[PDB]
Write a protein that binds this DNA or RNA. Structure first.
Length: 202
DNA sequence: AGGTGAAATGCG
DNA sequence: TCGCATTATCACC
């Protein structure tokens, strides 16, 4: 495993699946995952509504829901594909998950803006499992006190590419202290599907 | 209450 | 292209 470590950043990266396998899995994912459309894909930020620059889906146990930027998504019942991955992931990390956010970026122009994972529904201390398939993309971590016109402290930005069939483990207190994003990457033409598995509450 | 801080856009 | 700081409104803490 590759241990990524800065001030308040505890996370780890490894490649879980071969190319052949990851290729197979990526194919099933594409075949099976039903993405949200219309109303279920428009967040609100600074009081302005927008369709997300990508496609989303939530799969998970009954009852749970996932809310961000003015949008609430109740999860779809598990499917054999995802159920197989979470079990594999659960097995390797030790940790357990009852939910998964799926973002698919069709090309390097689809992206996600900066934020942390810090919602009431999120289990305090629980790690998050980012499992990527398809195109490599750069995943960027910036520190809480480092953003803005003139920051509190200036710390090295942490950049890294998330390869095909790879795991990124976001342990605690990572998501307390560090913002993350997937910036635009014009030179990318292929799609990427990312699975963030997490533990949700109530 | 009373405080904070968050998708596209427009720089360098 | 890319990084990233702005946005001047409003849900959430």
């Amino acid at each position: 495993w590759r241990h990524i470590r800065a001030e308040g950043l505890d996370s780890s990266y490894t490649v879980l699946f071969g190319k052949a396998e990851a290729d197979e899995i990526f194919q099933e994912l594409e075949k099976e995952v039903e993405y949200f459309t219309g109303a279920l894909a428009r967040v609100q930020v600074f009081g302005k509504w927008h369709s997300v620059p990508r496609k989303q889906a939530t799969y998970g146990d009954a009852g749970l829901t996932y809310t961000f930027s003015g949008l609430t998504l109740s999860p779809k019942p598990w499917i054999p594909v995802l159920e197989r991955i979470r079990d594999h992931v659960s097995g390797v990390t030790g940790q357990t998950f009852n939910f998964v956010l799926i973002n698919r970026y069709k090309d390097g122009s689809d992206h996600i803006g900066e934020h942390r994972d810090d919602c009431r529904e999120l289990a305090p201390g629980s790690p998050i499992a980012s499992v990527s398939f398809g195109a490599s993309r750069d995943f960027v971590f910036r520190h809480k006190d480092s953003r803005g016109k003139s920051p509190s402290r200036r710390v090295a930005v942490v950049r890294l590419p998330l390869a095909h069939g790879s795991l990124l483990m976001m342990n605690h207190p990572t998501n307390t202290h560090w913002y993350h994003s997937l910036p635009v990457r014009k030179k990318v033409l292929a799609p990427r599907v990312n699975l963030t598995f997490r533990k949700i509450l109530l």
